[PDB]
């Protein structure tokens, strides 16, 4: 138990009144951010590569695999640090609020953040309590005040709280100073309905009165005070120990299904890389087995290279092949992904369809990391009081769009069962010909009757069904019996039996739910038979735990408070804005990034396959096919902008036609575009194109001359033809996938091909004194003097884009 | 809101093309109608080109040039008789080919000092570390440092035509103009100052395998050192284990007579370059050229095979859509 002194003077171990809706502080930002950043397999792999290239002596500086890693890590860290800084500012507007405290015969105004345990706070009408107050006195007689906790437990009625009988007649902020008492209350608990305590008011002469306290005196934080001009309470709990803040389940790291698909793709492309490096090394050391295949008298090894250990040379060669083929695992993809996530999240804030006139603000974007999983939602968990409710503007025809999209809507509330069921009938969630399977406490006033009807209405009543016929109604007390008491029966587990009925009824209504049970329902749903993406949308402080628990949590900027709009990912100031937020914004958000991640792997496989096929015609000596000026610039200059602009402002379906039609949402549901089917198509197309480039350039180089003046080409000219075909093929491949041709796409797609051609003209054509290689002086400028090279490149471009044209002709008709 | 611009509201004007199968079917016919005639044009051009390649690496007991596969007295001299069934019409080009010669080997390609070959004063005295084994000998830096320059091809191929009498008439081979204009006129430069090239290479020494220094490669000041056509052509790597390098060109005579009239010829070669250690062949190639270059039926066969496959696929996809 804790000791509280009413006037904060005798008649420390407590924290300060503050709200922490953000993730990182200044101390744990780096250690906690590193764990989230290194959850990515590409970052882990390129950290291992950089670490190995420093501990041993290598022909490869570690800078080649350390600078990109450091750039990616600090690019995705500045964005997180800035996004969390906005959450730090959001808490400032509530912590540095204005509250009045009766310090000593004076109404000094402090901040809501500078309240200590044991100071007499004063709250006026319609004012929410800054902390967990204990009603000591009300200005009127009888010491009674009316409190509406519509944001704490969803009840819309007015609750009456009673003052302390000894101090009912203390008002005017003057007699409060002459009050000596000590409160011995219980350590804070999240029950929200029980409270044990004592007051030990001491008079000047003698008063040993110990008036026992109770929940009818405690005024919770987050509940507004109604129909009372002012009160006089004493703070006992001061934030992060308030009962409202103790129902918060705790922030975690949320990662969308696309970020998990990238990790699964990196596992397949890690096996391709380790297979290339092993096949090249094994064949290299059987090629070198011939005495004249290594040291053929025209290139001889130095003494240092000759006397080195062969077993260490195998490891060094394997690692060198890994470095040569390392572009197959893109790290420039993360910089593009985070940049497009940050710049695409602005389309939600800038939307004028999310603007509410009566409150004068639009949608909010707390995190941009989950834009793409708004288009992947499978379950919707909606509060009721404030969120669905009279009903809201379009609270009934928004649910119809969700049902047409294939979503499942569950109502999790803390209100009465009868009120909640009337509301579900009003919003047409329970139609007239819907048989209700009531599992409430009205019929389950026992522990063994639960089994007698959980199995009765599932095995014999639900298997004997239509899908829409039945609708479940569950209580908070009965859900506790289902969950807590299921630790014994494992043959017929209550949780599984209950979950079978939940998935077979059109709608589920959960009444009288504590804030930590609405999170348990989402946790049960999140774990069943796969990965159902869950959404929770609420407006009060009791929806915060289920908002932090779902895959993506939406908040409502309602009149109750902004507790759920600060712990959420997005916040629309209406329930009906969810239709446009999911159907129109989430669909495009997922479609853009799913195409971008597939294209990034296709791009790099087409880039590296011809370089791996070169080893069979080199001496397996890990000699790069392309120039060092092409290898680095391919991913950052020649092919970086077209995919950035596509995944930012490309609409495969017009934004005004998929909001009207909600059945297009289930086309992409289930991570459709990042599945094994599409992954295999993209990988096989990339392999076919990579083979075509190299073996169309290789058979062209059997001429002894490609131009009319009879001049021969080298290895760099062999590499520039393959690179030109590759760049044109992977750029015109995206031009075939584009359905929204803005002037920006016309500028980044044709401006990337026009810049590569001129960069050949310029890099090859100007002598730089500071360079020491000068190996590409006029390679392209002599390459362009031959007609037969132009005809071969155009032929190899159309051959590689032939499967794409064939699929457009076949699949994209009827 | 004041920010209800077209870009912020995702209502930018776009083109929105409809790539339906009824507007791509003509594409398959247009491509097949313009690829087939091109493929035929590149296919008869590849057949009208005359090219002969003769192998002279020995390795055969009855080969004329075998007598000096491992000669005791140098330089070797050996002649080979070949005949031309059809005279060469235009200006023909002399090539030399080497197989099993891995010029595109990582340890070989990077074995040059490109700054030193650019006429840099500082790189001449202290060459790079990449050309390590062939970098310094006798305490003096090698002037053309590296394996590429050290293993320069140094055979001497000459052609003679057997006239009506036994005595042969030598045909003139042009040396200058076989390398890229760019990499000879800018990329490859001599040291900057000096009266004669023998003085610019003061502190440097010749490569170990070379018989003469870089400043005595030819008696032409424009073709003497670091700008020698043959040296520049050799110092451009090969891209494949078997390759060809331009050696000489035979300019067409001002008369009506063909450049290489049909008859019996002599290819008498000073066998200096050994290639039998690494089981590599060695051949001389004479060939005529065209707008597309040399003889290669790959382009002609691929263009026809591509323009006929697309054409037939278009016909199939047109008859198929006759059901609907
Ligand atoms: C560059 C100059 C020439 C080099 C000289 C040759 C020798 C170089 C040798 C050493 C290595 C150098 C590497 C330094 C750079 C690494 C930086 C890095 O890592 O971040 C790179 C930059 O982020 C990006 O995606 C770019 C930012 C996002 C996309 C926006 C594009 C921004 C640029 C656009 C300009 C285009 C304008 C013109 C065309 C369009 C028309 C208007 C990404 O990494 P990456 O994919 O390139 O690295 C992979 C190689 N891996 C595995 C070894 C690390
Ligand atoms: C000299 C001899 O035995 N045979 C030669 C042969 O090598 C040649 C040929 C030229 O037509 O003339 C005869
Ligand atoms: C494989 C080969 O040709 N090696 C020779 C070598 O025997 C000779 O000592 C050197 C000097 O000219 O030239 C080279
Ligand atoms: C240039 C010349 O006359 N003879 C050279 C010889 O010195 C060298 O040993 C050999 C190695 O390739 O090449 C030939
Ligand atoms: C051609 O080469 C032979 C080889 O012995 C030598 O006599 C001379 O260099 C040339 N002879 C004639 C007749 O051209
Ligand atoms: Mg509510």
């Amino acid at each position: 138990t804790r000791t509280v002194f009413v006037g904060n003077h005798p008649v420390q171990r407590f924290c300060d009144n503050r709200i922490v809706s953000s993730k990182y502080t200044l101390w744990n930002f780096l250690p906690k951010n590193l764990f989230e950043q290194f959850r990515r397999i590409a970052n882990f792999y390129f950290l291992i590569i950089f670490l190995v290239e420093v501990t041993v002596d290598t022909p490869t500086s570690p800078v080649t695999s350390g600078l990109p890693l450091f750039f990616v890590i600090t690019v995705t860290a500045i964005k997180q640090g800035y996004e969390d800084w906005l959450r730090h500012r959001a808490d400032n507007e509530v912590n540095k609020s204005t509250v009045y405290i009766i310090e000593n015969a004076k109404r000094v105004r402090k901040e809501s953040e500078k309240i200590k345990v044991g100071d007499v706070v004063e709250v006026q009408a319609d004012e929410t309590f800054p902390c967990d107050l204990i009603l000591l006195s009300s200005c009127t007689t009888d010491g009674t005040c009316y409190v509406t906790t519509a944001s704490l437990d969803g009840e819309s009625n007015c609750k009456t709280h009673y003052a302390v009988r000894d101090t009912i007649a203390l008002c005017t902020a003057e007699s409060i100073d002459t009050l000596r008492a000590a409160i011995e209350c219980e350590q804070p608990q999240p029950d929200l309905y029980k409270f044990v305590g004592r007051i030990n008011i001491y008079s000047n002469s003698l008063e040993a009165v110990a008036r026992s306290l109770g929940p009818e005196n405690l005024l919770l934080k987050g509940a507004t005070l109604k129909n009372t001009e002012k009160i006089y309470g004493v703070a006992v709990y001061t934030g992060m120990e308030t009962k409202m803040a103790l129902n918060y389940q705790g922030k975690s790291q949320k990662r969308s299904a696309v970020e998990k698909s990238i990790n699964a793709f990196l596992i397949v492309y890690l096996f391709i890389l380790l297979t290339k490096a092993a096949v090249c090394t094994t064949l290299k050391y059987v090629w070198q087995s011939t005495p004249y295949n290594d040291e053929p008298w025209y290139n001889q090894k130095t003494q240092k290279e000759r006397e080195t250990l062969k077993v260490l040379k195998m490891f060094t060669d394997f690692l060198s092949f890994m470095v040569l083929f390392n572009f197959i695992i893109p790290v420039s993809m993360y910089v593009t992904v985070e940049m497009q996530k940050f710049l695409g999240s602005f389309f939600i804030s800038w939307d004028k369809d999310f603007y509410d006139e009566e409150i004068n603000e639009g949608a909010l974007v707390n995190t941009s990391d989950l834009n793409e999983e708004l288009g992947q939602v499978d379950y919707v968990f909606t509060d009721k009081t404030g969120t669905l409710t009279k009903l809201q503007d379009q609270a009934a025809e928004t649910i119809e769009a969700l049902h047409a999209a294939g979503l499942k809507v569950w109502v999790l509330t803390g209100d009465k069962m009868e009120t909640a069921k009337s509301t579900c009938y009003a919003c047409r969630l329970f139609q007239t010909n819907t048989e209700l399977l009531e599992l409430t406490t009205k019929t389950i006033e026992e522990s063994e009757r639960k089994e007698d009807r959980l199995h009765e209405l599932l095995i014999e009543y639900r298997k004997k069904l239509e899908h829409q016929e039945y609708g479940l109604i569950i209580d908070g007390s009965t859900l506790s019996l289902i969950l807590n008491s299921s630790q014994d029966s494992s043959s017929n587990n209550y949780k599984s039996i209950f979950l079978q009925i939940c998935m077979k009824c059109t709608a589920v209504l959960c009444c009288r739910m504590a804030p930590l049970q609405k999170a348990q329902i989402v946790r049960m749903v999140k774990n069943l038979k796969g990965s159902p993406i869950t959404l929770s949308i609420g407006d009060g402080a009791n929806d915060v735990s289920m908002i932090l628990e779902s895959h993506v949590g939406i908040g409502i900027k309602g009149k109750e408070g902004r507790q759920a709009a600060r712990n959420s990912d997005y916040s629309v100031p209406k329930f009906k804005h969810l239709k446009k937020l999911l159907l129109a914004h989430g669909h495009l958000y997922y479609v853009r990034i799913a195409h971008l991640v597939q294209y990034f792997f296709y791009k790099n496989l087409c880039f590296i396959l011809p370089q791996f096929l070169y080893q069979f015609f080199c001496g397996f000596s890990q000699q790069p096919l392309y120039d060092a000026a092409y290898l680095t610039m391919y991913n950052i200059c020649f092919t970086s902008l077209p995919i950035l602009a596509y995944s930012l402002l490309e609409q495969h379906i017009n934004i005004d036609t998929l909001t009207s039609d909600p059945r297009l949402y289930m086309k992409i549901s289930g991570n459709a575009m990042l599945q094994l089917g599409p992954f295999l198509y993209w990988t096989f197309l990339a392999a076919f194109e990579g083979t075509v480039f190299f073996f169309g350039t290789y058979f062209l180089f059997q001429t002894a001359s490609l131009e009319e003046n009879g001049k021969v080409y080298g290895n760099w000219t062999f590499g520039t033809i393959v690179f030109t075909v590759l760049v044109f093929t992977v750029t015109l491949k995206l031009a075939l996938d584009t359905r929204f041709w803005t002037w920006i796409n016309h500028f980044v797609i044709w401006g990337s091909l026009a810049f590569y051609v001129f960069f050949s003209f310029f890099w090859g054509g100007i002598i730089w004194p500071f360079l020491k290689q000068q190996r590409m002086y006029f390679v392209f400028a002599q390459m362009l003097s031959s007609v037969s090279t132009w005809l071969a490149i155009i032929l190899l471009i159309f051959i590689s884009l032939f499967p794409e044209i064939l699929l457009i002709v076949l699949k994209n008709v009827r | 809101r004041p920010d209800n611009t077209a870009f912020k509201q995702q209502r930018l004007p776009a083109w929105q093309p409809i790539l339906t199968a009824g507007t791509v079917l003509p594409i398959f016919f247009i491509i097949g109608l313009i690829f087939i005639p091109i493929g035929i044009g590149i296919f008869v051009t590849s057949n009208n080109i005359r090219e002969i390649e003769i192998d002279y690496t020995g390795t055969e007991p009855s080969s004329p040039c075998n007598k000096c596969l491992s000669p005791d007295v140098t330089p070797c001299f050996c002649t080979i008789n070949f005949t031309l069934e059809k005279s060469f019409e235009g200006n023909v080009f002399m090539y030399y080919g080497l197989s099993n010669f891995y010029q595109n080997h990582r340890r070989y390609v990077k074995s040059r000092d490109d700054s030193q070959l650019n006429g840099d004063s500082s790189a001449l005295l202290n060459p790079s570390k990449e050309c390590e084994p062939y970098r310094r000998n006798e305490d003096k830096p090698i002037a053309p440092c590296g394996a590429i320059m050290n293993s320069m091809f140094n055979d001497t191929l000459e052609l003679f035509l057997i006239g009506q009498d036994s005595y042969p008439i030598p045909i003139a081979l042009k040396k200058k103009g076989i390398a890229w204009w760019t990499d000879k006129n800018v990329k490859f430069r001599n040291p900057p100052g000096g009266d004669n090239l023998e003085e610019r290479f003061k502190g440097t020494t010749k490569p170990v395998n070379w018989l003469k220094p870089v400043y005595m490669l030819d008696s032409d000041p424009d073709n003497n050192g670091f700008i020698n056509e043959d040296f520049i052509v050799w110092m451009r790597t090969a891209a494949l284990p078997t390759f060809r390098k331009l050696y000489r060109l035979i300019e067409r005579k001002s008369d009506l007579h063909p450049t290489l009239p049909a008859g019996r010829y002599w290819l008498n070669v000073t066998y200096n370059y050994p290639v039998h250690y690494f089981d590599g062949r060695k051949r001389m190639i004479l060939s005529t050229i065209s707008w597309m270059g040399g003889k290669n039926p790959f382009l002609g066969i691929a263009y026809i095979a591509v323009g006929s496959i697309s054409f037939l696929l278009g016909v199939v996809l047109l008859v198929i859509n006759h059901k609907y």
Side-chain angles (χ1 to χ4, degrees), chain A residues 296-298, chain B residues 150 206-211 272-274 277:
Chain A
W297 79 251
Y298 46 85
Chain B
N150 165 82
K206 85 184 175 41
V208 200
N209 279 25
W210 286 21
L211 217 83
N272 286 325
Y273 205 66
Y277 303 63

Side-chain angles (χ1 to χ4, degrees), chain B residues 177-196:
Chain B
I178 66 195
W180 294 10
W181 183 96
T182 90
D183 79 342
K184 183 221 165 75
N185 287 118
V186 165
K187 175 182 173 169
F188 271 83
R189 312 265 65 171
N190 261 310
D195 46 339
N196 68 327

Side-chain angles (χ1 to χ4, degrees), chain B residues 1-148 150-324:
Chain B
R1 271 314 84 196
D3 54 8
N4 86 328
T5 88
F7 164 67
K8 310 197 178 190
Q9 303 301 317
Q10 302 212 56
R11 281 157 338 115
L12 269 172
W15 186 263
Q16 315 218 251
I18 286 305
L19 254 287
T20 204
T23 66
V24 182
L25 198 87
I27 271 293
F28 268 173
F29 276 67
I30 285 325
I31 272 177
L33 168 134
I34 74 104
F35 271 22
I36 289 187
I38 290 187
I40 282 136
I42 313 163
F43 178 79
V44 316
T45 308
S46 144
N47 274 6
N48 300 358
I49 284 169
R50 290 134 156 64
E51 172 231 5
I52 187 191
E53 61 185 338
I54 81 164
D55 198 327
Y56 66 97
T57 177
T59 56
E60 313 288 353
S62 284
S63 183
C65 286
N66 192 347
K67 62 180 213 58
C68 58
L69 218 54
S70 99
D72 287 297
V73 57
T74 42
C76 164
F77 291 147
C78 75
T79 182
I80 294 199
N81 288 249
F82 58 102
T83 203
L84 302 195
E85 283 52 12
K86 295 119 74 152
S87 81
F88 286 36
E89 321 290 342
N91 38 1
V92 324
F93 288 84
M94 217 178 168
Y95 294 92
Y96 59 83
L98 306 159
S99 39
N100 266 80
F101 203 109
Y102 287 95
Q103 270 213 301
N104 60 353
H105 192 280
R106 184 202 77 269
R107 195 203 322 141
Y108 189 93
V109 160
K110 75 165 186 34
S111 169
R112 50 204 293 167
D113 198 316
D114 263 311
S115 45
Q116 185 207 30
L117 308 151
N118 204 4
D120 215 39
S121 302
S122 158
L124 184 81
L125 268 206
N126 35 300
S128 147
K129 263 142 200 53
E130 304 288 355
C131 63
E132 186 37 56
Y134 321 94
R135 184 195 174 180
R136 316 174 25 87
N137 74 317
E138 299 162 11
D139 172 41
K140 291 165 91 23
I142 291 175
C145 90
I148 325 191
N150 165 82
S151 60
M152 194 202 143
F153 180 90
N154 50 29
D155 276 12
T156 299
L157 313 163
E158 294 154 81
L159 290 175
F160 295 81
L161 169 62
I162 297 330
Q164 74 263 68
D165 60 359
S166 35
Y167 321 129
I169 35 164
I171 51 196
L173 317 166
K174 267 86 190 73
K175 315 151 34 70
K176 254 174 73 63
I178 66 195
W180 294 10
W181 183 96
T182 90
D183 79 342
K184 183 221 165 75
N185 287 118
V186 165
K187 175 182 173 169
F188 271 83
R189 312 265 65 171
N190 261 310
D195 46 339
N196 68 327
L197 262 190
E198 213 269 292
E199 192 266 4
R200 312 193 205 180
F201 307 92
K202 260 294 217 263
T204 72
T205 202
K206 85 184 175 41
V208 200
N209 279 25
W210 286 21
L211 217 83
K212 275 181 333 163
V214 69
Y215 59 71
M216 260 196 324
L217 276 184
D218 193 288
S219 152
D220 214 27
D222 189 28
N223 231 52
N224 209 342
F226 277 8
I227 51 177
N228 201 235
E229 301 275 11
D230 313 67
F231 168 76
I232 288 173
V233 170
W234 179 261
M235 288 270 325
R236 172 160 312 277
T237 41
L240 287 174
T242 165
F243 60 92
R244 285 133 178 221
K245 294 198 165 311
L246 189 60
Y247 183 50
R248 306 267 172 277
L249 54 142
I250 313 171
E251 287 288 332
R252 47 158 153 243
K253 327 185 202 189
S254 285
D255 316 317
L256 180 280
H257 302 292
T259 292
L260 254 65
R264 276 169 342 280
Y265 287 80
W266 266 344
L267 189 269
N268 69 332
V269 17
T270 304
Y271 201 107
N272 286 325
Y273 205 66
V275 285
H276 64 283
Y277 303 63
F278 49 87
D279 271 280
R281 309 318 297 251
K282 202 162 54 147
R283 45 202 146 247
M284 171 226 76
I285 304 156
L286 291 146
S287 147
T288 69
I289 61 63
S290 48
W291 56 272
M292 67 169 183
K295 164 169 288 185
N296 192 228
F298 159 72
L299 261 194
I301 284 151
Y303 259 85
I304 302 178
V306 161
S308 101
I309 276 176
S310 289
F311 196 107
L312 86 87
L313 255 46
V315 152
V316 172
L317 296 209
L318 159 66
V319 48
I320 283 324
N321 305 17
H322 194 300
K323 315 176 165 181
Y324 330 122

